[PDB]
Amino acid sequence: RRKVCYYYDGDVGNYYYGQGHPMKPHRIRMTHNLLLNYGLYRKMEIYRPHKANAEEMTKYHSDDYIKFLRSIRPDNMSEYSKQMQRFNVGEDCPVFDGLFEFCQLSTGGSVASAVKLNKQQTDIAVNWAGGLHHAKKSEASGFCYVNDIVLAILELLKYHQRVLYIDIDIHHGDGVEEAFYTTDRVMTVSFHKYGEYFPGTGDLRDIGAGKGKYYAVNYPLRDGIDDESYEAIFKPVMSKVMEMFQPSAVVLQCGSDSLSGDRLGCFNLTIKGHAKCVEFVKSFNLPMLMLGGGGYTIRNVARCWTYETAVALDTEIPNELPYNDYFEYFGPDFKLHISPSNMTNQNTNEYLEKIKQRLFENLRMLPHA
Amino acid sequence: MRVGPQYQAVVPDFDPAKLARRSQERDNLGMLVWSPNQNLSEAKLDEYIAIAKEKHGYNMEQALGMLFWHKHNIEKSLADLPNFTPFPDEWTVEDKVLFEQAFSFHGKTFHRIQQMLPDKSIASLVKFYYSWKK
Amino acid sequence: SMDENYFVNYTFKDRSHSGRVAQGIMKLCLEEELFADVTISVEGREFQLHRLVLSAQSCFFRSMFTSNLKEAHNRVIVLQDVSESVFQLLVDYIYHGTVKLRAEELQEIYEVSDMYQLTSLFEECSRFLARTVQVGNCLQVMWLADRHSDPELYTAAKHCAKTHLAQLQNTEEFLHLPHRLLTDIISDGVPCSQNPTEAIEAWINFNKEEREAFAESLRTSLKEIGENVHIYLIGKESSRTHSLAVSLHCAEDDSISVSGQNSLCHQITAACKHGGDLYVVGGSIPRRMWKCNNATVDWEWCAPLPRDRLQHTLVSVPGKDAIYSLGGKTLQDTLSNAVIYYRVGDNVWTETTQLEVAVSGAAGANLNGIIYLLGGEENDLDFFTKPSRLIQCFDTETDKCHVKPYVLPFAGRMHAAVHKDLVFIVAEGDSLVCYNPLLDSFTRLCLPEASLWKIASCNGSIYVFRDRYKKGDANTYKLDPATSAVTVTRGIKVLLTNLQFVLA
Amino acid sequence: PGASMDENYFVNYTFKDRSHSGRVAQGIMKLCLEEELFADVTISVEGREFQLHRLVLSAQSCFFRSMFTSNNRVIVLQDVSESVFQLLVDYIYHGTVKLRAEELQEIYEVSDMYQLTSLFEECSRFLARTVQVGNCLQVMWLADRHSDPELYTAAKHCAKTHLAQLQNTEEFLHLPHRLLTDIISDGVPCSQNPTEAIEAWINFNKEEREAFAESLRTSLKEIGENVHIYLIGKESSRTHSLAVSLHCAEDDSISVSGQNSLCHQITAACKHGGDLYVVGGSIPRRMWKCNNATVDWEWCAPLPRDRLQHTLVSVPGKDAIYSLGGKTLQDTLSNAVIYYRVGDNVWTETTQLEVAVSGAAGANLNGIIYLLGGEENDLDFFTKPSRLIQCFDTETDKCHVKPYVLPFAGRMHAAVHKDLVFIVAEGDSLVCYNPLLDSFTRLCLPESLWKIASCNGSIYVFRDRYKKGDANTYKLDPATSAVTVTRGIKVLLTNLQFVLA
Ligand SMILES: O=P(O)(O)O[C@H]1[C@H](OP(=O)(O)O)[C@@H](OP(=O)(O)O)[C@H](OP(=O)(O)O)[C@@H](OP(=O)(O)O)[C@H]1OP(=O)(O)O
Ligand SMILES: Cn1nnc(-c2ccc3c(c2)[nH]c2nc(Cc4ccccc4)nc(N[C@H]4CC[C@H](N)CC4)c23)n1
Ligand SMILES: [Zn+2]
């Protein structure tokens, strides 16, 4: 029974991205409802995120970007085309009712979670609302409008010394890496698929520059990686980083679009190994901060996030889903875990040894402290 | 990868002697709705949850909020549970019928569906759409 | 080799000692008729021929010349019956290697070239006879393969006689057909509209009192299948956000029929057809693929695309039950070379060996074991992409990609569809060429201009379509590929206006 | 590839058979020689009888065409051989003959007598490869008499540079005027003493050739010995890296000339003509020009591009120095071919390579530029030891990759010898590439990466780490694999970064 605080609002489940769009902000509400039927509330605090504002939001983004996101509305759609087409808030990040309201809700959740973590009141802070780690400084990308994990890390940096960022999401966390590509107080470790995938960044040879050299550990993979390989690649590198970096706060972005068979997913990882990875990072009793981000199949996302919330609390849960409003929604297997698909992995053992050895050489160059 | 002050963040500096002064000054940015009670076991909570379910129609969130509203006192919660009507989105049968018609005519475009249902905000029809598809 | 040393002794492997001999024989042995030692006379005319080339190229002459009978040692040997002109063509082929096969004079060359065992000409004539059997001789060439044991022609002349069994029923040649041929033509899935039961009953009705108990042996072996040979059309109506999937059915009674529409409503890009069902990559994010069904109009779900690309080439291959995707563009104007292939029975997307030169927006044509990447655009080091002209051959059995040397007569965006061996090609500035991969040559076929053209091939005839629909005459041209007889069909009530993709 | 409009594939067309060269060429070698029917001519040479076929012989050699088609069943050839004519018939029928050094000249004379042009050219090349000093005045006599200009030049180049010890041979004393004029007017070296050769040739019959003597003096040219083997390496403790310029002598005394000792750094150097070209500087772009006699470090135009571990190959045919492959500081293996002109001091581009390689070995072949091995990029994020042979033409500016591959891979150093491309690599195994007939040979070495330099007809292979085993400078006889050890008189190097041939 460790003190874990949780953030949820009833408004985040209503915002709609449009017809035929991958990301559905209704998934978080069903994830909360699955927790709302497992009894996990009895051993975990539940808070309501506050609606964000401008001055705490402008700490990273430019003023004109926030002004646009405040002034946007679907009613003057055919009146401000230039402003849309410059800031890339068009067909890749569709506009809708209360877009800035969505940004307020997610930003308030993540920043208040950082305020809880940074005050030694709650050890592990969980917020599945935010985690949008693709928004850049003055432009939207990857369905992410405002970069919340960067704001959370910026808040943690005012009190802590060194903050370690962990990225399990299938996409490259370019948004967080872009902001901290020069500073020396944040180490961003991102495991992302890159043969041609979105966003195409995250090459091996891009490690850092300026003051922040060797303070960004990128790690490419290939499609179809199974569970045992992923564990064998996630245990050594994380132990090595936490041995030579000694951070005081770990912000883990627990992505959920790397599971077995999402619409934009490509990996072949089950919930069991994903939970084993997060438990591995959790087993270092550091001040944690969970985030969301990603996830494009509502059933799999709900199952994965409910099992992650269960493992963060160290509570065993039955495999059979309980009496609720979502009997036929989760069918027909009615279970919690997901069987792996038939995708054939393309990352051989020798490739994995070579990439781990290269990362070890890169990390040996960290200055002694 | 781009480099420039127009892309990266302006990191604040660290002061070892400033952590305590800054920590105790900031407010708790959030309102509490539930806290665990160690003296309150699971049996009577499981009973009271079905109590709120079947005769009065309370859902999980509103029923659990009342427990903290009375500081985890089940008896007082039973006393005051009929006094508060759990105000839902009042979807009358006619509202379901026109929502049915509008979905068939226009599809997933809820902005247009608002036109035949002007009294309901979009954030409310999306919730009913996800609840109906069950 | 450790034994040979270039300064003491080595073996001189001469790679030019095939051109010199083959040119010396065609130059010195034919243009002046010297060194003749055998005289072959066919139908009066006297020939002078050299025993060496003949005996070294056709084993039949090797057996005739090197026999032990005293008739062979006589100077003049007489061939009983081939022809006057056919034997001239055969001598021309044996010496030079270039013979002008004609449609009027092919079957004679087929039988004779099989009698003399010139297997290369025999195979070429087999293919060229498989090309030109429409319906009329489809039960006379079939009988010319069962008697000669050439199963490829026997299959290609059964496929085109099964699908016309209705009209073929009344012909007396079908009525005089022996049992084995009828058993082999019926037991392969006669189409539903051909009335095979009427055909078998009419075949018995010739002598029913002698074959009545013999009749039911075939009724217990008849197979039935429904007509599912289509020409799928996709195109939006330029005003409605939903792009339909009109499914044309090609009939033989000058009435090309239209089946039910599908009308998916997201977006359409780079679709493919395989078997009897349509595959389409689409959605707001072009990664998810829908699987359409023809009879039961439903939009099923399949495994989404694992990678990110646009303007790629979807090629169907029914040989190993796969759908290949090749080439493409990668979101930063970088042309990629990578082929991911999908299996219908497993819903998995794996990789294979990569292409040599990356192309995008090309046209692919299946050839029952070889996937051809035709044209498209290729990268240029001057920061740009130029209209490409390369013919990239991607194998699917051995998985090796190689680039053919010769190039197309034109370049740019193009659409291709196959016809019985060939890869027909059309592009902007109408000029219909007729690719042929086995002997690597082109032809041409002018089109009536008085707008990019689309090609779909079905029922033996080739239908070319327009992009802009404003009613000139019917904007749907039925082309006869033999005599270039460009006719115009009806297009009964097609409501299309853009015609984004036409699938063969 | 001809878009013919007359032919239609459903009516008529021309069946161009591309397999109708193998069938006849195999049918003749199987049916006409293995069991010998269809024989209609009988050629008897030195008692032994042949049955042959006038068709093939008259279709391959024009002399037999003029013979058979003139205006008896058995015809006897006057004088060729028993074995040479057997080899000639075997080549005419099959297409493979085993050329030997002992019976080569006879085959050359006969193959030119019967006008088999391909074997005549192959014998010309193979006989040009094997003239050291002994028959260099006998082969020259068989080139002027035979009108074979390439062999005549090849047997004159190797005879001009050995004029000192060739003076006392009586064959040179009985040498007619024209060949002497042509061997003298080519730039006889300084140490060969040409004037004493002139006087000694006249001294046979001076009272009859005295007035004829001065006709050659008015045509003699003089030049100094400037055939060098440039060595570049540091001494592992001094920043400046020297450029010792060896001079190869024929009296078992390899001489060392003056050093130059540039002081910045050296990477990817080359040699052309008689001077040295080097790439160096703190930023690897500025280029120095080294002169041997007048020891100076001249300046040339810098590199217009940015690359590392690239291959510099000399092309004296068009007075241009090329640069292929390399690495562009982002671990991206580039394929860009830039060339520099000596007389114009410009740095322009050409076509690009097909597959990019880095750190290979380049060998000029008097018209084609060979990229040998190295390491090629892998889509598996890394570099594997490459094995392909990349061809880069310099006359037509075309690039293509040969199908066959090397027997090994990795880092390697290459040098040429009169037609060939000699190769050594790690784990010594001397292979002898031959591009004209596409075959490999091997030459074992007595067992550290090795280096190869070519001069004076022999090959010299060096070591990287010196520490004195015997001399660390091996002279190899490429004919009988006679690996001997030279002196290396007072070489003070310790690294041997590059060896320029
Ligand atoms: O109503 P939405 O939230 O927009 O999502 C629906 C829903 O998918 P989710 O369960 O992921 O929300 C459908 O699923 P079912 O109700 O049929 O289980 C799915 O249909 P498929 O099963 O065919 O995927 C459909 O997809 P589509 O629009 O392609 O028919 C998809 O709609 P969106 O594409 O708009 O998200
Ligand atoms: C979190 N996350 N995960 N995946 C994505 C994501 C997001 C977007 C795309 C995407 C994946 N795949 C895509 N493929 C294409 C096809 C294509 C290929 C090559 C060249 C051009 C287009 N176009 C896409 N967007 C267009 C590009 C122009 C821009 N104005 C927005 C619309 C996207 N986001
Ligand atoms: Zn993601």
Residue numbers in the entry:
A (entry chain C): 8 to 376
B (entry chain D): 1 to 134
C (entry chain B): 26 to 475, 481 to 534
D (entry chain A): 23 to 93, 99 to 474, 481 to 534
Please quote the paper that reports this structure.
By co-opting KBTBD4, a substrate receptor of the CUL3–RING E3 ubiquitin ligase (CRL3) complex, UM171 promotes the degradation of the LSD1–CoREST corepressor complex, thereby limiting haematopoietic stem cell attrition. KBTBD4 contains an N-terminal BTB domain, a central BACK domain and a C-terminal KELCH-repeat propeller domain. As expected, KBTBD4 forms a homodimer through its BTB domain, which is characterized by a domain-swapped two-stranded β-sheet (β1 and β5)34. The predicted CUL3-binding 3-box helices of the KBTBD4 BTB domain are extended by five short helices in the BACK domain, which is connected to the KELCH-repeat domain through a linker sequence. Together, the BTB-BACK modules of the two KBTBD4 protomers give rise to a V-shaped platform, which holds the two KELCH-repeat domains on the same side of the E3 homodimer without physically contacting one another.
To resolve the mechanism of action of UM171, we next assembled the KBTBD4–UM171–LHC complex in the presence of InsP6 and determined its structure using cryo-electron microscopy (cryo-EM) at an average resolution of 3.77 Å. KBTBD4 and HDAC1 are well resolved in the three-dimensional (3D) reconstruction map, whereas only partial densities are visible for the ELM2-SANT1 domain of CoREST in the rest of LHC. Overall, the KBTBD4–UM171–LHC complex adopts an asymmetric architecture, in which two protomers of a KBTBD4 homodimer, hereafter referred to as KBTBD4-A and KBTBD4-B, simultaneously engage one molecule of HDAC1–CoREST in a bidentate manner. Although the SANT1 domain of CoREST is within close vicinity of KBTBD4, the closest Cα atoms between the two proteins remain 9 Å apart, and therefore complexation is exclusively driven by interactions between KBTBD4 and HDAC1. The two KBTBD4 protomers interact with HDAC1 through two distinct interfaces: (1) KBTBD4-A engages with the outer edge of the HDAC1 catalytic domain; whereas (2) KBTBD4-B cups HDAC1 at its active-site pocket. A single molecule of UM171 is situated at the HDAC1–KBTBD4-B interface. By interacting with both HDAC1 and KBTBD4-B, UM171 fills an exposed gap between the two proteins with exquisite shape complementarity to act as a glue. Directly adjacent to the UM171 binding site, InsP6 is nestled at the three-protein junction between HDAC1, CoREST and KBTBD4-B to stabilize the complex as a second glue. On the HDAC1 side, UM171 inserts its N-methyl-tetrazole into the active-site pocket of the enzyme, contacting Phe150 and Phe205. On the KBTBD4-B side, the pyrimidoindole core and the benzyl group of UM171 are embedded into a surface groove between the b–c loops of blade 2 and 3.
